[PDB]
Design a protein around this nucleic acid. Structure first.
Ligand code: ZN
Ligand code: ZN
Ligand code: ZN
Ligand code: ZN
Length: 119
DNA sequence: AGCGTGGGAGTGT
DNA sequence: TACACTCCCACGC
């Protein structure tokens, strides 16, 4: 499980299994973002081409992922997935606090809830 | 709230 | 590198 490709940038402990992953990560320290958005004077740019393509759905308005329950359409597949939990009632994130037995559909819901517990 | 919805990131083919 | 899937974090209401 050892990651041979380690970043040598000061203060960074990132390591990867592939050289391409490390080479892509190195663009974070250099700021290189070769994939610029050319829609309607947009200033967004990305180090990865797939991040640009996902972003450009903002301009085209395309919602490729449709809920098979309520037929609502969504720009991203991960947001479709968490949306469908509003139908199924799946809540895979439990608090684990002694008295609290609340569950949540998304991890960021549980993170906000955990902030209420102390002592 | 609970949940829409974006960037950033890791990893799969 | 292209493309696809997944998860975290964040903002907003
Ligand atoms: Zn680094
Ligand atoms: Zn754009
Ligand atoms: Zn739905
Ligand atoms: Zn709790």
């Amino acid at each position: 499980h050892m990651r041979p490709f380690m970043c040598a940038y000061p203060g960074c402990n990132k390591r990867y299994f592939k050289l391409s992953h490390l080479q892509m990560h190195s663009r974070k320290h250099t700021g290189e973002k070769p994939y610029q958005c050319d829609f309607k004077d947009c200033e967004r740019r990305f180090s990865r081409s797939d991040q640009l393509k996902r972003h450009q759905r903002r301009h085209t308005g395309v919602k490729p992922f449709q809920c098979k329950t309520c037929q609502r359409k969504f720009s991203r597949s991960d947001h479709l997935k968490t949306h469908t939990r509003t139908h199924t009632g799946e809540k895979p994130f439990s608090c684990r606090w002694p008295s609290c037995q609340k569950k949540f559909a998304r991890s960021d819901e549980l993170v906000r809830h955990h902030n209420m517990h102390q002592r």
